[PDB]
Amino acid sequence: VKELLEAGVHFGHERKRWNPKFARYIYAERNGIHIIDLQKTMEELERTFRFIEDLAMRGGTILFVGTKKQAQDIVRMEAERAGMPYVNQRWLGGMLTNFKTISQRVHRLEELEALFASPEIEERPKKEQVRLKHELERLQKYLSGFRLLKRLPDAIFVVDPTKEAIAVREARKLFIPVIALADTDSDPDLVDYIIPGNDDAIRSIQLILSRAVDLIIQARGGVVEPSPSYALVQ
Amino acid sequence: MLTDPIADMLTRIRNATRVYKESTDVPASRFKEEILRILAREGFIKGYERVDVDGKPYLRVYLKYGPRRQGPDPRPEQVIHHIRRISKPGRRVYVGVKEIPRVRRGLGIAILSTSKGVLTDREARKLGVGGELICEVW
RNA sequence: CGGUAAUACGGAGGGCGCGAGCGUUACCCGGAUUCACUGGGCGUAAAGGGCGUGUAGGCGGCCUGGGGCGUCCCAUGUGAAAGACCACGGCUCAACCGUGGGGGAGCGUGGGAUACGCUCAGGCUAGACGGUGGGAGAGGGUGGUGGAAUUCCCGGAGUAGCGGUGAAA
RNA sequence: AACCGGAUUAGAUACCCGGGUAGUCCACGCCCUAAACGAUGCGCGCUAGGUCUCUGGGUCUCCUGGGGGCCGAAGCUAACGCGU
Ligand SMILES: [Mg+2]
Ligand SMILES: [Mg+2]
Ligand SMILES: [Mg+2]
Ligand SMILES: [Mg+2]
Ligand SMILES: [Mg+2]
């Protein structure tokens, strides 16, 4: 049930913080704001959800990335409402390109899982029961959705692409397709598959990013409810 | 004043194509029209068509590009890689059939104005004529 | 390279390269797109004239027509032999030599093309210039005039210093 | 500027202090040079934007000129940078 839910509160965004490359996907500057053409969101959306459905039904791996204010949490939900990996707090230098190395973090994080459950559940020179047990905080806080990713992803899905362009950079560096929700902030030409929208409105980020996660499972049956995502939607 | 119309055109096309535009106006002449047909016929552009713009004749030009591309920098390859004046008002270049250039062992044009009319190099060669060597595209 | 451990000097042995030769000096083209036609450059590397005005010169918008100078094409003449090149011969080989073949810009001549450049005739209005109405400005020249400050002179009042420096004189 | 003195200093033909001619100003006539600098000749056409600002015009959120600045697409450059 799309169409009207788009123009709900999720159509147009920014003003004169713009990229002229995005000139095609705009209805008009009326009122001094940019209002983005909805008809062309839909057009782009099918082409995007097609890519999604196919990658999914061939049993792929989409890596989700949203590290901005209003994405932050809706991402770690819909990522796992889909059993898919995500990056949530901090995109690190070479998650995709130094992968093998950034991976010996995960390697060694769950070597500590193997000391939270151990004959060392209450022992070891007790100023390591923070030093280590607090090292597992950094490892926790960051590698939450990166831990499940075990070989480079098949796509990546970005929420604000100019916000997160150090990711996109590396995607392309490895020919990994890039799906992004983009708005006038941003440069389409290096989004591989484009959801031209509002990068900011939490209503928007939710409406879209969730409905993409219908597909991701409804290409495998057992579709769920309206799903845990209205963090404090107000 | 506008010293070389043909070059201006050759350039308007160079410039537009490099920011991947879809179309380009150029103010209109008959000789300008001609070069554009050879351009169109050899599939460097999609084509052209007259227009009027503010009471006045222009020729809109529909450029053409490759497919979007792989890695970092997905900008298309370009159908017109190289377009370049040769005869110029400050130094005219004329050649006879015997001395007509073979642009890029075959893969290239050399538009070329003769008494039989504006012509590619192979056209001109086969018709057996030479002339003011206008330019070259590859 | 050489200042007591020298594959760089001098001799040894050995090794490398050419061989009836091998080295050296001079001169030429090369590499040198390092005078750049092919084929270069000038903010800071060498290099934009101190600025204008404009002479000659170079360059010149859109459309049509005449001419055919530039330019292109076809024929034909010229382009000696030697040389160079490809063949096939002759001195036992080759060097040398001979016989034959194949080319070519440039120029005269006859004929032809007219897209481009030239020229001549006529047209357009997008370049340039003018009209009308309006504007901001330490743009220039002439005269005139205003107040603050310093210096000097006259008057009042008034006393032992002032000024000056890092400190002083 | 010069010059005549006071200083400072190993010296001090200087920097600091006290004086001071040419000159600085005006008329007319010469000289013709400069880091005469944007170290970028003149003109025209083409090639994303954002922001501040001077002066016009309109249908006066802003739009359309002409000038003055910064940032920066494409591209350029040995680089630093240049970038309607
Ligand atoms: Mg040379
Ligand atoms: Mg100058
Ligand atoms: Mg002049
Ligand atoms: Mg023989
Ligand atoms: Mg003095």
XYZ file of C-alpha atoms (C1' of nucleotides) and ligand atoms in Angstrom:
630
model
C 0.000 0.000 0.000
C 2.247 2.827 -1.386
C 1.141 5.852 -3.573
C -0.474 8.130 -0.917
C 1.673 6.948 1.971
C 4.604 8.605 0.138
C 3.061 12.104 0.010
C 1.997 11.385 3.637
C 4.941 13.376 5.106
C 7.923 12.069 3.074
C 7.926 13.805 -0.313
C 10.090 16.952 -0.628
C 13.199 17.814 1.487
C 16.033 20.547 1.819
C 16.712 23.952 0.116
C 19.880 25.342 -1.633
C 22.077 22.775 0.125
C 21.501 21.064 -3.205
C 23.262 18.990 -5.816
C 22.357 20.064 -9.310
C 22.857 16.389 -10.445
C 19.583 15.741 -8.647
C 17.782 18.186 -10.910
C 15.758 15.545 -12.720
C 14.025 14.136 -9.645
C 12.449 17.472 -8.510
C 8.885 18.611 -8.978
C 9.532 22.223 -7.942
C 10.994 24.864 -5.658
C 7.769 26.275 -4.263
C 7.756 28.222 -0.976
C 11.575 28.299 -1.039
C 11.814 24.529 -0.271
C 12.593 21.653 -2.683
C 9.606 19.314 -3.348
C 10.583 16.068 -5.026
C 8.585 14.382 -7.807
C 6.736 11.379 -6.467
C 5.805 9.770 -9.799
C 9.608 9.370 -10.277
C 10.146 7.881 -6.826
C 7.767 5.113 -7.808
C 9.425 4.599 -11.194
C 12.796 4.313 -9.445
C 11.295 2.190 -6.645
C 10.158 -0.752 -8.797
C 13.558 -0.871 -10.500
C 15.050 -0.905 -7.048
C 12.790 -3.477 -5.434
C 13.217 -5.696 -8.474
C 16.970 -5.648 -7.835
C 16.162 -6.367 -4.196
C 13.717 -9.271 -4.737
C 16.075 -11.037 -7.153
C 19.177 -10.668 -4.957
C 17.082 -11.956 -2.061
C 15.417 -14.920 -3.794
C 18.822 -15.962 -5.119
C 19.557 -15.873 -1.349
C 22.025 -12.956 -1.218
C 23.282 -10.515 1.460
C 22.353 -6.806 1.645
C 24.505 -4.847 4.101
C 22.546 -2.005 5.714
C 24.159 1.270 6.739
C 22.522 4.132 8.624
C 24.623 6.027 11.161
C 22.628 9.291 11.225
C 20.427 10.744 13.946
C 17.021 9.503 12.746
C 18.221 6.243 11.111
C 20.484 4.902 13.914
C 17.816 2.657 15.526
C 15.262 1.876 12.814
C 18.294 0.301 11.077
C 19.314 -2.258 13.740
C 15.628 -3.323 13.844
C 14.784 -3.733 10.153
C 18.248 -5.182 9.622
C 17.343 -8.074 11.960
C 13.630 -8.107 11.126
C 15.478 -9.382 7.993
C 18.420 -11.323 9.551
C 20.667 -9.062 7.420
C 23.869 -7.349 8.609
C 24.050 -3.576 9.362
C 26.536 -0.823 10.486
C 25.001 1.546 12.999
C 27.298 3.770 15.083
C 30.514 4.259 13.073
C 31.456 3.271 9.500
C 35.142 2.170 9.883
C 38.000 2.682 7.438
C 37.910 -0.396 5.259
C 34.909 -2.383 6.506
C 34.675 -3.548 2.875
C 38.224 -2.882 1.656
C 40.224 -3.976 4.662
C 37.543 -6.552 5.431
C 39.926 -9.439 6.078
C 41.538 -7.253 8.793
C 38.522 -5.478 10.167
C 37.307 -9.082 10.442
C 39.853 -10.225 13.030
C 37.899 -7.945 15.317
C 34.780 -10.077 15.050
C 37.218 -13.066 15.123
C 38.445 -11.903 18.551
C 35.193 -10.420 19.900
C 33.587 -13.823 20.116
C 36.826 -15.182 21.569
C 35.523 -13.148 24.532
C 32.075 -14.598 24.211
C 34.220 -17.662 24.997
C 35.266 -16.070 28.307
C 31.889 -14.576 29.399
C 30.835 -18.226 29.240
C 33.865 -20.003 30.796
C 35.546 -21.435 33.904
C 36.561 -17.762 33.589
C 32.997 -16.478 34.253
C 34.257 -15.072 37.615
C 38.129 -15.257 37.563
C 41.402 -13.943 35.915
C 43.641 -11.222 37.575
C 40.514 -9.161 38.328
C 41.570 -5.860 36.582
C 41.118 -7.774 33.300
C 37.467 -8.357 34.244
C 37.060 -4.742 33.097
C 40.024 -4.115 30.689
C 38.763 -7.113 28.709
C 35.122 -7.013 29.779
C 35.162 -3.292 28.813
C 37.083 -3.959 25.559
C 34.036 -6.055 24.641
C 32.061 -2.779 24.827
C 33.743 -1.130 21.809
C 33.451 -4.524 20.066
C 29.825 -4.768 21.134
C 28.824 -1.227 20.307
C 30.135 -1.276 16.697
C 30.334 -4.813 15.310
C 26.634 -5.598 16.097
C 25.463 -6.183 12.507
C 28.921 -6.519 11.077
C 29.504 -9.738 13.098
C 27.039 -11.814 11.023
C 28.627 -10.671 7.696
C 31.176 -13.454 6.852
C 32.065 -12.736 3.204
C 31.729 -9.431 1.391
C 28.126 -8.381 0.918
C 26.138 -8.686 -2.309
C 24.653 -5.187 -2.160
C 24.702 -2.327 0.269
C 21.778 -0.169 1.269
C 22.512 3.365 2.448
C 20.140 5.791 4.141
C 21.879 9.173 3.471
C 24.567 8.622 0.836
C 26.381 11.985 1.186
C 26.274 11.481 4.881
C 27.742 8.022 4.317
C 29.910 8.432 1.192
C 33.050 6.720 2.637
C 31.039 3.554 2.450
C 29.785 4.071 -1.100
C 33.376 4.926 -2.116
C 34.495 1.379 -1.104
C 31.402 -0.337 -2.471
C 32.228 0.889 -5.960
C 35.917 0.124 -5.385
C 34.805 -3.535 -5.257
C 31.895 -3.389 -7.732
C 29.457 -4.024 -4.902
C 26.155 -2.446 -5.994
C 24.889 0.469 -3.937
C 21.238 0.926 -3.139
C 20.550 4.182 -1.367
C 17.719 6.351 -0.264
C 18.872 9.683 -1.667
C 17.740 13.265 -1.614
C 18.846 16.661 -2.954
C 21.821 16.563 -0.492
C 23.226 13.917 -2.768
C 24.794 12.861 -6.078
C 22.696 10.235 -7.871
C 25.294 9.205 -10.453
C 27.124 6.974 -7.910
C 24.084 5.425 -6.343
C 23.616 2.230 -8.350
C 19.906 1.885 -7.415
C 18.129 5.021 -6.275
C 15.221 5.687 -3.891
C 14.827 9.431 -4.462
C 13.140 10.606 -1.303
C 13.571 12.317 2.057
C 16.885 11.357 3.742
C 15.761 12.953 7.014
C 12.075 12.493 7.997
C 11.848 9.478 10.351
C 8.392 8.773 8.917
C 10.070 8.520 5.502
C 13.151 6.544 6.573
C 10.695 4.111 8.191
C 7.996 3.892 5.509
C 10.638 2.992 2.900
C 13.378 1.095 4.680
C 10.832 -1.265 6.262
C 8.849 -1.976 3.056
C 12.151 -3.007 1.492
C 12.328 -5.585 4.305
C 8.906 -6.947 3.372
C 10.447 -8.051 0.032
C 13.625 -9.365 1.696
C 11.559 -12.010 3.568
C 8.474 -12.076 1.240
C 11.019 -13.624 -1.147
C 11.055 -16.582 1.223
C 7.574 -16.524 2.909
C 6.468 -15.802 6.495
C 5.901 -12.032 6.242
C 5.444 -10.360 9.648
C 3.380 -7.493 11.176
C 3.834 -3.726 10.755
C 7.038 -4.647 12.723
C 8.935 -3.130 15.725
C 9.764 0.345 14.379
C 8.160 3.499 15.861
C 10.994 4.202 18.309
C 9.284 7.231 19.866
C 7.584 8.156 16.557
C 6.469 11.616 17.854
C 32.831 38.528 -33.398
C 32.886 34.679 -33.683
C 35.893 33.930 -35.861
C 35.176 30.256 -36.645
C 31.609 28.970 -36.604
C 32.591 25.471 -37.604
C 35.049 25.274 -34.690
C 32.573 26.814 -32.309
C 30.214 24.043 -33.159
C 32.906 21.365 -33.054
C 33.569 22.635 -29.553
C 30.011 23.137 -28.278
C 29.775 19.429 -28.996
C 33.087 18.681 -27.250
C 31.967 20.684 -24.189
C 28.371 19.395 -23.830
C 29.402 15.786 -24.342
C 31.950 16.070 -21.454
C 29.284 16.911 -18.824
C 27.113 14.220 -20.393
C 24.358 16.601 -21.562
C 21.466 15.256 -23.694
C 21.197 18.141 -26.163
C 23.003 21.314 -27.479
C 21.888 24.332 -29.466
C 24.222 25.810 -32.081
C 23.392 28.739 -34.241
C 22.428 27.514 -37.644
C 24.080 27.458 -41.013
C 23.893 25.302 -44.069
C 27.513 24.263 -43.848
C 26.951 23.543 -40.169
C 23.955 21.324 -41.092
C 26.137 19.315 -43.459
C 28.849 18.328 -41.077
C 26.066 17.207 -38.689
C 24.605 14.694 -41.214
C 27.974 12.985 -41.625
C 28.196 13.017 -37.875
C 24.712 11.501 -37.586
C 25.149 8.990 -40.456
C 28.330 7.534 -38.846
C 26.496 7.253 -35.523
C 28.521 9.667 -33.380
C 25.342 11.466 -32.507
C 21.715 10.459 -32.548
C 20.985 13.422 -34.827
C 19.884 16.990 -35.069
C 16.920 19.110 -36.005
C 16.291 22.769 -36.768
C 14.539 24.983 -34.300
C 13.873 28.601 -33.597
C 15.081 30.259 -30.403
C 14.144 33.887 -29.776
C 13.135 34.540 -33.414
C 16.355 32.983 -34.590
C 17.573 29.677 -36.200
C 19.504 27.150 -34.082
C 20.208 23.461 -34.676
C 19.511 21.355 -31.644
C 21.999 18.417 -31.352
C 21.212 15.063 -29.688
C 24.423 13.562 -28.332
C 25.019 9.916 -27.603
C 27.072 7.990 -25.092
C 27.930 4.489 -24.029
C 26.271 2.472 -21.323
C 26.762 3.398 -17.614
C 29.820 1.676 -16.306
C 31.288 -0.458 -13.654
C 33.412 0.580 -10.720
C 34.496 3.880 -9.145
C 33.452 6.481 -11.721
C 30.431 5.003 -13.539
C 30.434 7.642 -16.182
C 29.797 6.294 -19.589
C 32.358 5.891 -22.269
C 31.789 8.476 -24.855
C 30.789 7.870 -28.499
C 32.687 11.006 -29.636
C 36.098 10.593 -27.984
C 37.946 13.171 -30.079
C 36.647 15.926 -32.329
C 39.125 18.499 -33.773
C 39.407 21.362 -36.319
C 42.135 21.076 -38.907
C 41.629 23.669 -41.589
C 41.266 26.925 -39.638
C 40.883 30.545 -40.699
C 44.470 31.290 -39.624
C 45.780 28.247 -41.552
C 43.697 26.424 -44.198
C 44.509 22.756 -44.882
C 43.752 21.308 -48.302
C 44.541 17.781 -49.495
C 44.241 15.809 -52.682
C 42.792 12.264 -52.744
C 46.339 10.845 -52.705
C 47.052 12.450 -49.263
C 43.791 11.831 -47.435
C 44.379 10.682 -43.841
C 43.257 7.304 -42.513
C 42.072 8.216 -39.009
C 42.884 5.522 -36.478
C 43.554 2.571 -38.798
C 39.934 2.743 -39.984
C 38.015 3.254 -36.751
C 37.989 7.042 -37.358
C 36.346 9.707 -39.475
C 37.862 12.652 -41.347
C 35.106 14.987 -42.499
C 36.347 16.748 -45.522
C 34.803 19.462 -47.814
C 35.049 18.933 -51.654
C 33.514 20.212 -54.918
C 31.376 17.034 -54.821
C 30.287 18.271 -51.359
C 31.025 17.560 -47.681
C 32.230 13.933 -47.363
C 33.945 11.345 -45.169
C 37.444 10.229 -46.089
C 36.367 6.853 -47.560
C 33.478 8.528 -49.393
C 35.910 11.116 -50.878
C 38.555 8.460 -51.563
C 36.109 6.295 -53.467
C 34.629 9.332 -55.318
C 38.322 10.138 -55.926
C 38.331 13.728 -54.693
C 40.202 15.794 -52.084
C 39.546 19.199 -50.502
C 39.655 21.412 -47.401
C 40.202 18.860 -44.674
C 37.601 20.050 -42.164
C 38.272 17.990 -39.082
C 38.507 14.562 -37.553
C 36.341 12.524 -35.152
C 37.122 9.305 -33.357
C 88.173 7.915 -9.111
C 93.408 8.759 -5.704
C 94.287 11.232 1.773
C 97.830 2.797 3.433
C 93.102 -2.625 1.809
C 91.782 1.571 -4.961
C 87.267 -4.043 -9.458
C 88.295 3.814 -11.592
C 95.781 5.168 -11.020
C 100.667 1.589 -12.758
C 102.226 -3.680 -13.552
C 100.650 -8.709 -13.350
C 97.196 -12.930 -14.278
C 92.407 -13.457 -16.041
C 88.180 -11.548 -18.742
C 85.078 -8.645 -22.462
C 84.882 -6.456 -27.910
C 86.610 -6.112 -32.531
C 90.323 -8.491 -35.748
C 94.556 -6.896 -40.580
C 93.136 -4.051 -38.061
C 91.971 -1.425 -33.515
C 92.103 3.136 -30.926
C 92.290 8.863 -30.876
C 91.256 13.951 -32.602
C 88.293 17.090 -35.846
C 83.627 18.010 -38.696
C 78.134 16.581 -40.273
C 72.999 14.503 -39.334
C 71.107 11.707 -34.992
C 69.247 11.002 -30.289
C 67.428 17.036 -29.160
C 59.244 17.614 -29.670
C 66.360 21.534 -26.976
C 63.463 26.970 -32.952
C 58.355 22.538 -31.768
C 55.143 22.825 -40.136
C 54.737 17.616 -38.688
C 56.013 19.018 -33.060
C 56.939 23.641 -27.705
C 55.827 27.451 -24.600
C 54.877 32.663 -21.094
C 50.657 33.302 -12.587
C 55.358 31.342 -9.225
C 60.464 27.612 -13.800
C 63.452 31.684 -19.465
C 59.016 34.425 -21.228
C 52.569 39.442 -21.477
C 54.662 45.157 -24.151
C 53.552 50.303 -18.208
C 48.237 52.002 -20.554
C 45.682 53.598 -24.417
C 44.559 55.386 -29.448
C 44.645 53.664 -33.724
C 48.227 53.043 -39.584
C 49.533 49.076 -42.663
C 48.767 44.033 -42.220
C 46.352 39.189 -40.396
C 41.274 37.589 -39.405
C 35.651 38.000 -40.480
C 27.828 36.775 -39.050
C 23.003 34.508 -41.746
C 20.648 33.756 -46.995
C 20.866 33.911 -52.511
C 23.106 34.619 -57.267
C 27.338 35.532 -61.088
C 32.739 34.663 -61.912
C 36.212 30.102 -61.217
C 41.909 33.519 -58.689
C 42.850 29.961 -54.185
C 41.425 24.447 -53.799
C 40.144 19.381 -56.065
C 39.954 15.782 -60.439
C 41.361 13.667 -65.711
C 44.306 13.647 -69.822
C 49.034 15.133 -71.903
C 54.216 17.332 -72.178
C 58.548 17.914 -69.127
C 61.101 15.452 -64.939
C 68.820 13.498 -69.398
C 72.325 9.668 -68.168
C 74.698 8.071 -63.608
C 72.857 7.331 -58.556
C 68.750 5.146 -55.085
C 64.912 0.859 -55.485
C 63.062 -4.494 -57.471
C 64.507 -8.197 -60.607
C 67.774 -11.179 -63.889
C 72.761 -11.736 -65.582
C 78.995 -11.338 -65.633
C 84.093 -11.640 -63.144
C 84.952 -19.055 -58.634
C 81.781 -15.387 -54.236
C 81.270 -10.493 -53.120
C 83.010 -5.442 -53.638
C 82.647 -3.850 -58.751
C 79.859 -4.265 -63.283
C 75.863 -4.883 -67.007
C 70.703 -5.605 -69.076
C 65.618 -4.611 -67.913
C 61.658 -2.785 -64.773
C 59.224 0.381 -61.536
C 58.091 4.986 -59.473
C 57.868 10.938 -58.000
C 56.813 15.935 -56.252
C 57.279 20.878 -59.091
C 56.065 23.349 -63.661
C 53.652 24.145 -68.847
C 49.017 22.732 -71.769
C 43.683 21.049 -72.751
C 39.324 19.772 -70.313
C 36.143 19.497 -65.924
C 33.919 20.204 -60.097
C 32.143 24.794 -57.151
C 31.508 22.362 -50.904
C 35.302 25.701 -48.487
C 38.497 30.368 -49.052
C 38.653 34.854 -52.532
C 35.906 38.366 -55.595
C 31.348 40.921 -57.737
C 25.930 41.930 -57.285
C 21.711 41.884 -54.000
C 19.246 40.762 -49.583
C 18.608 39.856 -43.977
C 19.287 41.297 -38.343
C 21.418 37.562 -33.770
C 27.647 41.213 -34.228
C 28.791 46.643 -33.919
C 26.807 51.627 -33.748
C 22.977 55.241 -33.105
C 17.603 57.076 -30.797
C 14.617 57.909 -26.568
C 13.810 57.585 -21.305
C 16.325 56.574 -16.515
C 20.831 55.658 -13.154
C 25.381 55.286 -9.633
C 30.449 57.153 -9.356
C 37.325 60.100 -4.820
C 36.723 59.642 -13.597
C 39.262 64.723 -15.583
C 39.908 70.255 -15.968
C 38.739 75.549 -13.913
C 37.404 78.840 -10.364
C 35.673 79.502 -5.282
C 35.137 78.369 -0.299
C 35.024 75.691 4.993
C 36.697 73.722 9.633
C 40.242 70.686 12.885
C 45.521 70.563 13.602
C 50.825 72.106 13.478
C 54.471 76.462 12.978
C 55.311 81.773 13.551
C 53.804 86.924 15.395
C 50.755 90.321 18.949
C 48.026 90.490 23.660
C 46.474 88.505 28.518
C 47.493 85.464 32.585
C 51.520 82.682 34.893
C 56.604 80.058 36.805
C 60.922 76.815 36.319
C 61.561 73.848 33.562
C 60.373 71.552 28.936
C 61.613 68.077 25.474
C 63.473 63.668 24.494
C 65.174 57.721 25.656
C 66.018 51.447 26.798
C 68.860 54.916 29.659
C 70.591 59.354 28.383
C 72.636 63.612 25.927
C 68.200 62.760 1.310
C 72.919 65.615 1.941
C 74.754 67.894 5.990
C 75.725 69.554 11.544
C 75.472 67.744 16.249
C 73.860 64.035 20.731
C 73.905 58.953 21.705
C 74.974 53.293 21.123
C 79.122 50.176 19.656
C 84.966 46.330 19.578
C 84.167 50.142 15.631
C 78.836 52.635 14.000
C 80.410 56.769 7.813
C 73.650 52.913 10.621
C 69.414 51.734 13.155
C 67.555 55.758 18.389
C 67.584 61.464 19.709
C 68.205 67.256 18.395
C 68.613 70.413 14.214
C 68.677 70.988 8.743
C 69.395 72.389 2.786
C 67.690 70.389 -1.883
C 62.998 68.455 -2.231
C 58.109 67.827 -1.088
C 53.295 72.592 -2.989
C 51.829 76.051 -7.481
C 52.798 77.811 -12.788
C 54.865 76.527 -17.354
C 58.280 73.239 -19.940
C 61.527 68.451 -19.852
C 62.643 63.121 -18.204
C 59.492 58.150 -19.556
C 61.301 54.546 -15.388
C 59.091 50.915 -11.595
C 57.528 44.269 -7.480
C 54.038 50.404 -13.829
C 51.721 43.324 -10.032
C 46.435 39.886 -11.039
C 53.879 39.033 -11.692
C 47.737 36.486 -15.765
C 47.728 41.025 -23.595
C 42.790 42.258 -26.322
C 38.104 40.254 -28.207
C 34.262 36.709 -28.978
C 31.513 31.727 -28.231
C 30.968 27.400 -25.084
C 31.129 24.581 -20.136
C 27.255 22.651 -12.443
C 26.290 25.197 -8.367
C 26.528 27.840 -3.466
C 27.494 32.500 -0.644
C 28.549 38.024 0.500
C 28.347 42.658 -1.973
C 28.015 47.601 -5.252
C 24.771 49.721 -9.064
C 20.119 49.121 -12.533
C 15.388 47.044 -14.047
C 10.693 43.675 -13.004
C 5.347 40.891 -11.937
C 10.355 43.145 -5.931
C 10.006 35.055 -1.134
C 13.112 36.238 -5.290
C 13.772 37.049 -10.889
C 16.830 39.594 -14.917
C 21.290 42.528 -16.222
C 26.356 45.166 -15.266
C 30.501 45.258 -11.583
C 33.234 43.496 -6.869
C 34.829 39.034 -3.481
C 35.124 33.932 -1.417
C 33.986 28.437 -2.056
C 34.315 25.181 -5.178
C 31.160 20.421 -10.959
C 33.792 19.097 -15.237
C 38.300 19.895 -16.799
C 43.734 21.938 -16.351
C 48.291 22.144 -13.740
C 55.268 19.730 -11.988
C 52.856 20.973 -8.033
C 50.648 25.330 -5.119
C 46.681 26.513 -7.569
C 43.042 28.321 -11.439
C 38.008 27.044 -11.732
C 31.123 31.797 -15.952
Mg 65.273 18.927 -34.590
Mg 49.931 44.013 -18.167
Mg 42.718 48.822 -31.163
Mg 76.055 -14.709 -59.854
Mg 66.679 63.000 12.159
